[PDB]
Amino acid sequence: EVLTVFHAGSLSVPFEELEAEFEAQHPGVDVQREAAGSAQSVRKITELGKKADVLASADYALIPSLMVPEYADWYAAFARNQMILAYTNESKYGDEINTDNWYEILRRPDVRYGFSNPNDDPAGYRSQMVTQLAESYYNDDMIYDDLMLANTGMTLTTEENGTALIHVPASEEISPNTSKIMLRSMEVELSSALETGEIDYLYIYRSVAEQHGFEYVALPPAIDLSSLEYADNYSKVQVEMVNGEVVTGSPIVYGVTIPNNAENSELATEFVALLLGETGQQIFIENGQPPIVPAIAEGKDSMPEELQALVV
């Protein structure tokens, strides 16, 4: 028996642990994972005619947006990422920093922080969103100005409806104050720089911090993009990139489905049951991608009975 699983690259570590566990309890089974970007993984099914037993997206909304109803009848939001501020024992004021004061530490002139290119990398525009959202949370209307506007060519306007709009110029025009900011397209350059102490703090996902053994400051769920329940707070910030595309703050939440054309749906059910069950929950916890428990499903009445038991 073969089980074909198409998953987002960022699900690679937990899905490997899932594959091992699944093969252990099911001796006959060959689990064949294919990792790609989330939209790319979906398009294999919805455009390229490829058949998977399981599709897991790093943005759950791609599923209803591109697969429903032709390729899927249900989906489940099962885990999340969360923006954090990473540091190490070599970072300035690392002993002082906490959820209440992180932006005050970053305002100190001798502290340097890193984030990804907001044109290129969702981690990049997400660092801007989280910093702007902080203003309303901590009642301090100068956080984004002091940390980002004062030190880059990014600008900010307020759209008639109250929404904060961050404008990112051409990458070559962001021109960061390099005493305050390290900005890179390649995330590995930023995590290397944090490790050597070239930067003090780094805006990245919790999963990436845990993989590197970095310390981190957990940020309030009202601002950290992790939580379905704060979706209306997150949408109060938008980012416009050089090309004109606009992105809106929103929860970073993973989704799963078994496609309508799965060649082994019964084996897929067993795999998703492992994923949504206690075993999969611990695996996700251990990779810094906290599970949503029970998972929240749409189209629950069309799900296999076994999976219905594992969703809200």
Swiss-Prot record:
Superkingdom of the source species: Archaea
InterPro entries: ABC_trnspt_W-bd_WtpA, ModA/WtpA
Keyword entries, A-Z: Signal
Biological process per Gene Ontology, one example term: molybdate ion transport
NCBIfam families reported for this sequence: PRK04168.1 (NF003196), tungstate_WtpA (TIGR03730)
Homology family: Belongs to the bacterial solute-binding protein 1 family. WtpA subfamily.
Name of the protein: Uncharacterized solute-binding protein MA_0280
Organism taxonomic ancestry: Archaea, Methanobacteriati, Methanobacteriota, Stenosarchaea group, Methanomicrobia
